[PDB]
């Protein structure tokens with residue numbers, strides 16, 4: 001019921017490009033993989049191209065593709081993300097790390113030909129030198145979360161909020177509160193959803209032959225909350 005829905009019935013190649021500055025530490029990440037929205041499935045490999053990543057890889061997972069969520073057929077009228085394609089959407093976030101600094105991000109997600117592209121600028125400030133982020137105290141793992149979606153009708157987009165729980169090496173938890181807004185790039189109509197959420201599961205791993213600083217990500221994203 002959108003033109004965009006049909007762009008995602010098969011396997012779609014994905015590119016991710018991020019430039020970051022966290023407390024003056026500048027870095028870039030390039031990612032490649034593919035997405036199969038029929039199964040809510042994402043498989044991606046990220047590589048830090050400027051050397052060693054200066055923050056923990058788990059802190060960047062949410063920044064590095066919600067147009068690949070599997071929306072059940074009865075919920076397809078609530079898929080804002082695909083409806084903005086191919087022209088795309090801007091995805092903006094503030095991520096507040098409890099007792100620590102914050103990330104501000106701006107992403108443009110759209111098709112470049114047949115390839116779905118996520119281009120990101122990230123700015124992190126007020127981080128603690130011996131905090132869990134700059135001190136690299138977060139485990140290389142990931143929890144499952146619900147991301148809550150609301151229409152923003154006076155902006156023709158959506159508002160999204162959720163809390164990520166990052167495991168800390170001492171057994172504790174680093175909360176990362178996400179405030180998110182998405183707005184279409186083009187001028188065409190989009191689908192404005194009723195309230196609902198995306199259930200997310202993610203698995204981080206390493207490529208045994210890769211010597212560069214990297215992250216392999218397997219994700220499943222499923223819309224829910226409307227019956």
Ligand SMILES: [Ca+2]
Nearest residue numbers: 135136137169
């Ligand atoms: Ca450590």
Ligand SMILES: [Ca+2]
Nearest residue numbers: 192193194195
């Ligand atoms: Ca309605």
